[PDB]
Amino acid sequence: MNPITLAIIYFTIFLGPVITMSSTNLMLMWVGLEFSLLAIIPMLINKKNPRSTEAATKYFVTQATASMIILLAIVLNYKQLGTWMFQQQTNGLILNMTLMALSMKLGLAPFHFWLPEVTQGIPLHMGLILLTWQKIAPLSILIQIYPLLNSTIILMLAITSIFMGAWGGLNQTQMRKIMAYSSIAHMGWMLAILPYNPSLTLLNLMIYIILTAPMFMALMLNNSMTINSISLLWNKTPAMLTMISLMLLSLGGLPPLTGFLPKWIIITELMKNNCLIMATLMAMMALLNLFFYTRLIYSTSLTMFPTNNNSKMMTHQTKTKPNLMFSTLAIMSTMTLPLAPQLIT
Amino acid sequence: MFFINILTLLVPILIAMAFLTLVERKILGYMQLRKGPNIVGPYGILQPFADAMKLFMKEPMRPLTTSMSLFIIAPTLSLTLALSLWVPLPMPHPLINLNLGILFILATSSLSVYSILWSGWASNSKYSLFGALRAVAQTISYEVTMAIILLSVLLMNGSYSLQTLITTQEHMWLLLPAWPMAMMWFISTLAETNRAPFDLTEGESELVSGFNVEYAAGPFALFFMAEYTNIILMNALTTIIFLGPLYYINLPELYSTNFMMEALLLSSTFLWIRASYPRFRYDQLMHLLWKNFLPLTLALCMWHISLPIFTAGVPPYM
Amino acid sequence: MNLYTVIFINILLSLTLILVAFWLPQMNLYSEKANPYECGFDPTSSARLPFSMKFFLVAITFLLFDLEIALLLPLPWAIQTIKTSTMMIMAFILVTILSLGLAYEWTQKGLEWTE
Amino acid sequence: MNNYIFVLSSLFLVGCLGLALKPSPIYGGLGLIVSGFVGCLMVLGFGGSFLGLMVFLIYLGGMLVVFGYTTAMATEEYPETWGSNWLILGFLVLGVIMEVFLICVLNYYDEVGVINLDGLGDWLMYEVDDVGVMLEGGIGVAAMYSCATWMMVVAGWSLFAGIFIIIEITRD
Amino acid sequence: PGIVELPTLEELKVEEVKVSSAVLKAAAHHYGAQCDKTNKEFMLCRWEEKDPRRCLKEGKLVNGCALNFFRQIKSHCAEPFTEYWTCLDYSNMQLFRHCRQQQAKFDQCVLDKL
Amino acid sequence: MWFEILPGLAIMGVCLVIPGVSTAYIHKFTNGGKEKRVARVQYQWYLMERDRRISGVNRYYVSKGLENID
Amino acid sequence: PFLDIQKKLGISLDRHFMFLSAEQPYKNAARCHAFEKEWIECAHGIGGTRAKKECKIEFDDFEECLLRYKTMRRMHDIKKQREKLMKEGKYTPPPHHSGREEPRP
Amino acid sequence: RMMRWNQERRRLLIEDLEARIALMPLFQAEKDRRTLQILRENLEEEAIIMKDVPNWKVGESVFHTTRWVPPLIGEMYGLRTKEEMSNANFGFTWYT
Amino acid sequence: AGRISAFLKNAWAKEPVLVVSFSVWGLAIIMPMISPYTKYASMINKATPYNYPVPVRDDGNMPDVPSHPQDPLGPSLDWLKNL
Amino acid sequence: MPSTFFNLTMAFSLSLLGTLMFRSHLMSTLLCLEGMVLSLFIMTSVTSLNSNSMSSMPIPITILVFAACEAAVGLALLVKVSNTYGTDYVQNLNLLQC
Amino acid sequence: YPSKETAHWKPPPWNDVDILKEKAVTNMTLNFGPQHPAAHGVLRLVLELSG
Numbered sequence A: 001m002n003p004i005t006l007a008i009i010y011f012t013i014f015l016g017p018v019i020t021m022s023s024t025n026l027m028l029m030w031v032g033l034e035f036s037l038l039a040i041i042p043m044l045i046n047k048k049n050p051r052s053t054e055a056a057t058k059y060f061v062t063q064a065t066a067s068m069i070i071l072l073a074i075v076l077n078y079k080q081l082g083t084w085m086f087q088q089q090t091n092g093l094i095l096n097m098t099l100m101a102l103s104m105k106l107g108l109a110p111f112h113f114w115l116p117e118v119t120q121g122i123p124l125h126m127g128l129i130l131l132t133w134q135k136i137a138p139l140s141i142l143i144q145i146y147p148l149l150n151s152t153i154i155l156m157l158a159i160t161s162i163f164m165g166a167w168g169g170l171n172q173t174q175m176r177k178i179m180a181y182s183s184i185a186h187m188g189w190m191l192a193i194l195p196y197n198p199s200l201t202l203l204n205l206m207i208y209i210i211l212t213a214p215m216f217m218a219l220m221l222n223n224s225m226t227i228n229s230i231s232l233l234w235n236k237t238p239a240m241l242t243m244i245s246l247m248l249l250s251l252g253g254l255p256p257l258t259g260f261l262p263k264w265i266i267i268t269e270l271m272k273n274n275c276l277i278m279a280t281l282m283a284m285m286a287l288l289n290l291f292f293y294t295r296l297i298y299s300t301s302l303t304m305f306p307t308n309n310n311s312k313m314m315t316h317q318t319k320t321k322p323n324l325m326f327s328t329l330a331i332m333s334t335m336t337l338p339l340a341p342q343l344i345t
Numbered sequence B: 001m002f003f004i005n006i007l008t009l010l011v012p013i014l015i016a017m018a019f020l021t022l023v024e025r026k027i028l029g030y031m032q033l034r035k036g037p038n039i040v041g042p043y044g045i046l047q048p049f050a051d052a053m054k055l056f057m058k059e060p061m062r063p064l065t066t067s068m069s070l071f072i073i074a075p076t077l078s079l080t081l082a083l084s085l086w087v088p089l090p091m092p093h094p095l096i097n098l099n100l101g102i103l104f105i106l107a108t109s110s111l112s113v114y115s116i117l118w119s120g121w122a123s124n125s126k127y128s129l130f131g132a133l134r135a136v137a138q139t140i141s142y143e144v145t146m147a148i149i150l151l152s153v154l155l156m157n158g159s160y161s162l163q164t165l166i167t168t169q170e171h172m173w174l175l176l177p178a179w180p181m182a183m184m185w186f187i188s189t190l191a192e193t194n195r196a197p198f199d200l201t202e203g204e205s206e207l208v209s210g211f212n213v214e215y216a217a218g219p220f221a222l223f224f225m226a227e228y229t230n231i232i233l234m235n236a237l238t239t240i241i242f243l244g245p246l247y248y249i250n251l252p253e254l255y256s257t258n259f260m261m262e263a264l265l266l267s268s269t270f271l272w273i274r275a276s277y278p279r280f281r282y283d284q285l286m287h288l289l290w291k292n293f294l295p296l297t298l299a300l301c302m303w304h305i306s307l308p309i310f311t312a313g314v315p316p317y318m
Numbered sequence C: 001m002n003l004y005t006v007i008f009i010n011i012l013l014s015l016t017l018i019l020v021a022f023w024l025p026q027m028n029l030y031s032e033k034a035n036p037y038e039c040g041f042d043p044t045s046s047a048r049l050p051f052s053m054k055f056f057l058v059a060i061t062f063l064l065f066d067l068e069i070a071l072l073l074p075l076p077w078a079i080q081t082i083k084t085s086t087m088m089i090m091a092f093i094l095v096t097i098l099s100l101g102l103a104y105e106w107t108q109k110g111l112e113w114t115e
Numbered sequence D: 001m002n003n004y005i006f007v008l009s010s011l012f013l014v015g016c017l018g019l020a021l022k023p024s025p026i027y028g029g030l031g032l033i034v035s036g037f038v039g040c041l042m043v044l045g046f047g048g049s050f051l052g053l054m055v056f057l058i059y060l061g062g063m064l065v066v067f068g069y070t071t072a073m074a075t076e077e078y079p080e081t082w083g084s085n086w087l088i089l090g091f092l093v094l095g096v097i098m099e100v101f102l103i104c105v106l107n108y109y110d111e112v113g114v115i116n117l118d119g120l121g122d123w124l125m126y127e128v129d130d131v132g133v134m135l136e137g138g139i140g141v142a143a144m145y146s147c148a149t150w151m152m153v154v155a156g157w158s159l160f161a162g163i164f165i166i167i168e169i170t171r172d
Numbered sequence E: 001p002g003i004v005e006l007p008t009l010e011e012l013k014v015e016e017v018k019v020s021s022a023v024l025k026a027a028a029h030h031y032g033a034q035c036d037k038t039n040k041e042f043m044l045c046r047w048e049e050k051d052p053r054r055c056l057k058e059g060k061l062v063n064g065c066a067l068n069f070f071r072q073i074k075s076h077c078a079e080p081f082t083e084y085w086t087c088l089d090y091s092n093m094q095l096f097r098h099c100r101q102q103q104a105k106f107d108q109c110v111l112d113k114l
Numbered sequence F: 001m002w003f004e005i006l007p008g009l010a011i012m013g014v015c016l017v018i019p020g021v022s023t024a025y026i027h028k029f030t031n032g033g034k035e036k037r038v039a040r041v042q043y044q045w046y047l048m049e050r051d052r053r054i055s056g057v058n059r060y061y062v063s064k065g066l067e068n069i070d
Numbered sequence G: 001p002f003l004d005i006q007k008k009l010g011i012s013l014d015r016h017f018m019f020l021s022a023e024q025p026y027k028n029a030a031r032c033h034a035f036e037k038e039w040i041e042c043a044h045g046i047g048g049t050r051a052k053k054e055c056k057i058e059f060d061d062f063e064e065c066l067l068r069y070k071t072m073r074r075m076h077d078i079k080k081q082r083e084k085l086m087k088e089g090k091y092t093p094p095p096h097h098s099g100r101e102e103p104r105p
Numbered sequence H: 001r002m003m004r005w006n007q008e009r010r011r012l013l014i015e016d017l018e019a020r021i022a023l024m025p026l027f028q029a030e031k032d033r034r035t036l037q038i039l040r041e042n043l044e045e046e047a048i049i050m051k052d053v054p055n056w057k058v059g060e061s062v063f064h065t066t067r068w069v070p071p072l073i074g075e076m077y078g079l080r081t082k083e084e085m086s087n088a089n090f091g092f093t094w095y096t
Numbered sequence I: 001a002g003r004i005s006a007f008l009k010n011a012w013a014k015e016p017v018l019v020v021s022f023s024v025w026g027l028a029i030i031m032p033m034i035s036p037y038t039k040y041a042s043m044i045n046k047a048t049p050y051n052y053p054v055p056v057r058d059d060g061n062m063p064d065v066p067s068h069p070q071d072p073l074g075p076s077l078d079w080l081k082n083l
Numbered sequence J: 001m002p003s004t005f006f007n008l009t010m011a012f013s014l015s016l017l018g019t020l021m022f023r024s025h026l027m028s029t030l031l032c033l034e035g036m037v038l039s040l041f042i043m044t045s046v047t048s049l050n051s052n053s054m055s056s057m058p059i060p061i062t063i064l065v066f067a068a069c070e071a072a073v074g075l076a077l078l079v080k081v082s083n084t085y086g087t088d089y090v091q092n093l094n095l096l097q098c
Numbered sequence K: 001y002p003s004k005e006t007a008h009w010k011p012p013p014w015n016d017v018d019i020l021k022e023k024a025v026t027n028m029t030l031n032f033g034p035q036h037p038a039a040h041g042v043l044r045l046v047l048e049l050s051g
């Protein structure tokens, strides 16, 4: 690489969502989305393998099409009302096109097909940057239009994203695809609670981000790609196992881990708004999510898969783990349930 | 009366470009220690007419491996764009007065490049493909340079019109305030017209005929007419922009005469350049523009941004 | 309406010229005449194969610089503004960052026709 | 002379239909050049000429680089124009017939008033300041230099970052 | 909703100036300096009350003072004003810079008389 | 010698003088002894339309002076 | 979410061109300046559901100004009745509407 | 030389715009009177001869605001001839 | 400095286009900051009257604004006349 | 104006259908993307000119700048695809399914 | 969970790089024939070109 273009690209990656979430003009939100996409593409295609090229191409055409639909919605709103924000009396067709295009930006089902494809064939840190940072700007736009959303389309997208994410993560054995389907399921939960409480989708987004940051960090430590690769972790880094298991259980939503809190409070708000059918279906598919997490836990922690001869040399060498980032986020993402009234806002 | 005005614009321009072919052959001959044509006419003045009649009485010879639609569309497109580009020039009163005259000029020039590209791709031959790709590279380089040059010069001017250029150059030329822009604009007009040194699209030595290698007589004559009309037009645009003719409200005939003299001088300068210099390589043209003219014209564009601000000489809107 | 009439007259003139060129002379068409030229031999390829241009980065840079041109072109109306200090600063910044991009590409050998 | 803008909009629809029908990218760039010229004419008819000429120049440069790339890599031995498959021509004329059918339906259904045959050409330009200087398009694009410096700086940073982005993508 | 009220042809009738734009521009400065009170009254009512239907008397006063100004011009000295406005009418933009001599003669007229 | 190019140069000279001179003369003939009266802005177009309405022959170039006022 | 760094820092990056009746370049208007001004002054301070309820008159006037659906329908009805009367021979247009009028400046 | 000549041209432009300013109120008064005349003749021609349909108000506006709304070009030239409507739509644009 | 002068002289001999471009860039930066005519451009663009000057009401409490264009009050343009 | 805006919206819809329905050519997909861009530019310009929103006239220039940036990135990715395979076929780039 | 519709799949490579060599660049063959002005009347210079 080169430090100058590293600084330019990473600053533009930062600047995109910041402009989107701090700008009150829909045009400036759109140019923030464009900033994020165009800046993150060279970080995706960096290893210059065919898989990286394919992932960059798929991501580019998907996000470009979705952003074009977003800009269509903005221009139609400007035609209808003369302003640059959906105020209160816009067209429901415009709002539904906005929701559909932002769903394809976010990557929730049935627009979810590219997300495991792009997450596969991409290095783990770029998968982390995608699955955490790229989902804040479209969520910021969705939170900005908090009323005047179609709850029917919202709930349909939410339920199909949770269903398809649970099934996909159940099938997959590649770790990056597992993380992508986890992303799809949690985005389904956030979108489900979006029209009733912006605070709860913000809370679920924060819980998901602080939960899947150290999961990706622990994958990044040993460059573990598959279930077998994470299975020979007892020989590589045996101190990782308890935190890995606790974070996987917290992603599953088991009490008393703090990952139970977003699902619990979202179910509470949906009970307050009388959507028991959707809440029950979402909870059962979250149990399916917990099943594929628990199979991962069986592979990596509660059993000891066979190891090979060169792991002796791996034990001979020395390692390095980031301070202030892994352990802090792991503790805050596992043992922060009794601070639930402070976490909800 | 307007159709009569169209005729008195179009027909003299076509006769002027035919005699530009004659003047080019004679000037190149006399710089080559020989004569020009002096047998066909009294002094060779019937030579372009004989050439035109021969080209329009030879068969056009449609080829087999050829996209016929684009193959026919491209030369007619080139000729109509050359005449459309001739439309808005003021001498000192234009046939069609446009507010954004220079923008119209730039758009029409780019569309002429498209005519060359479509001819080269439609005539499904390797030398035609080579000529089309060379045209792509050439127009990349001169397009960016020409846009910056015109931006700085018309920032010294007021609006994007051309009667405003006449009123700006009423007292003094624009060559003295911006002569480096005039030099780079002259080189860019050479590149736009695909003339020597850097023709590179009809390269007789590197290629056989470039993009015209499959065009037989007829549409080939149309391409030649478009090219030479563009030569006279770029020289006319250069003398309107930079070498401002004398304008008096009572009589415009001396303006037309001064414009004629300077346009003839710059056309003869084009033929002079062709006689003098060898050909560039088409990567060397891109390197030359993007490494010498583009930084200098970016700096001079910044200087001409700053100049009316610190001299308080901002031009009027009208 | 006037410009429209002149455009249509020029188009009709070019069409008339090419129609005269196609219907005036005598036609004698056969296969060896209408074969592609290729300097007196049959072409090996089909002239539609990939060409692999060598200045692709320069072409993409040309796209970006053309849009920088589109940004820079409203300057003749921009200099008529009432502020003129923010206008001058903004024009300086725009030209400077365009020049910085060109300089960075030149240093990183972007416009060097990699074969 | 009233339905001139409607004729232009129909031509733009036809050009976008051809671009959607996806010829060889040579003819796709041709269709986009024609559509860009037609949209320029529409903007010029509706008002200021600067925006139309800008989009025309920009798309001329863009389709030129596109032509170079589809000659370089996005080509094949027999580039289909439109007649390699009769389905493409049949679908083009089917879309044209559907366009005529829908505009006839919306003329017959004149309650909403989106398209009216008798009222066409009557509501093109709504209200204009008859006496007035400096009210044409391009003054606002100039006001990007003084009143929307945030728009100017995000566009400039987009182009700068784009230079860095394309160098790093095609670094190889 | 309500019926929009607007005046009739009888109250819209006025003695129009029937004077071309070139002669108007030739006399523009002295017209703008002679009765600027009436014109500014009309502009003040027009910008305060956005309705044009409640400034018709002020508009008729503007027409009246313009007619009086042109009648004074026609009565006192007419031929240098005539040659001045025809020289202005000659050019395509009515530029004052072309015919400053006739402008000087007309200014000498309106300075010696009136 | 070198002056043999002067016939072709003179033909080009007259063919470049003709269009501008003819355009100016045709503008004068069509506009009645005056220039084209170009209208860059809406104010100038309004002046032209007002002149066309004032003249009464639906021609903007027929200038009306002080003879219309008694 | 929606950060408010522009309101916190007091700057206006993109807030002066949010709507039509806002800071035109020289002194111009946007063809519905009065209607949009009345609608915004109605809706300010009570925003959301109350602005949707009890500023419906101002919003309907502004939407009618901007889109002109009712004026189009009224003019179409007038022209349709005129054409029907022309077909039935019961109407002759006046000279000023059809043909030569007396031009006033 | 360009500095001096551009300053002189700025002075000339200020003189021309001041002539325009001095002529502005007369044009404003005549324009308002002509607009009101066209609206009144349209209102009368719609009133007496055009509309005998039972459910129709003649001078009914489409706004509740009961103030002056300036008419559209298609509103004031709608009953006029098609050539006049086309001149009002594309006069300045096509004049080139 | 010797090395700086030698480098600049070598650059002026060998690549006298980048030297000219950087010098012109620096001159265009510096010259507005030292010219005494910089304020005059903004003042000229302010004084150019593209709009009608809308009159104000006479409440009798403002003596600064004039009562007629032929008055000593108001922003006179004698600086532009003598510029 | 409403008829023209309906035509422009239908043109955007056609270009969106072209983007969604692939025919073996990533370049043709990028062409459909830029057709969508052109339709949006014409819609925004016509709306601003009709409403006299001269303050919002920089919006089409902004969307043109960002659209050309995304077209630049797409052309660079197409160059990388062609270097990888040599055919530029969207069905040929498919190996991330497992 | 391999089925009849996915039994032909393979696991991804560990380093996300797989061998996909074609070597089918097909450099353009152009002959400077014995009619080219650059050719000295009589020369068939067959050129393998990469652009």
Ligand SMILES: CCCCCCCCCCCCCCCCCC(=O)OC[C@H](COP(=O)([O-])OCC[N+](C)(C)C)OC(=O)CCCCCCCCCCCCCCCCC
Pocket: B180, B182, B183, B184, B186, B187, B197, B238, B242, B273, B277, B288, B291, B292, B293, B296, I015, I017, I020, I023, I024
């Ligand atoms: C239209 C008006 C007339 C114009 C001139 C027409 C007549 C003359 C025609 C001559 C023949 C042209 C035929 C084509 C030639 C093509 C080759 C060519 O020109 O290459 C360009 C050549 C290139 O030279 P080069 O390519 O040999 O350079 C070597 C560079 N390397 C090693 C990297 C390859 O020159 C230029 O680029 C110069 C452009 C003009 C520069 C003008 C600078 C003026 C001074 C500025 C200010 C200086 C002071 C600084 C501040 C001081 C403050 C106090």
Ligand SMILES: CCCCCCCCCCCCCCCCCC(=O)OC[C@H](COP(=O)(O)OCCN)OC(=O)CCCCCCCCCCCCCCCCC
Pocket: B073, B076, B077, B080, B081, B084, B097, B098, B099, B100, B104, B107, B108, B111, C001, C003, C004, C007, C008, C011, D041, D044, D045, D049, F039, F040, F041, H092, H093, H094, H095, H096
């Ligand atoms: C062989 C096929 C060739 C096809 C391509 C033809 C190319 C033509 C030449 C290049 C044109 C490039 C674009 C130019 C657009 C016009 C430029 C312009 O500024 O127009 C605006 C102008 C009036 O604007 P303005 O100057 O502001 O005046 C107001 C007060 N004076 O003027 C106007 O408003 C006039 C608007 C119309 C002007 C263009 C008319 C074009 C007509 C269609 C031509 C093609 C038809 C299809 C093919 C026919 C069959 C081959």
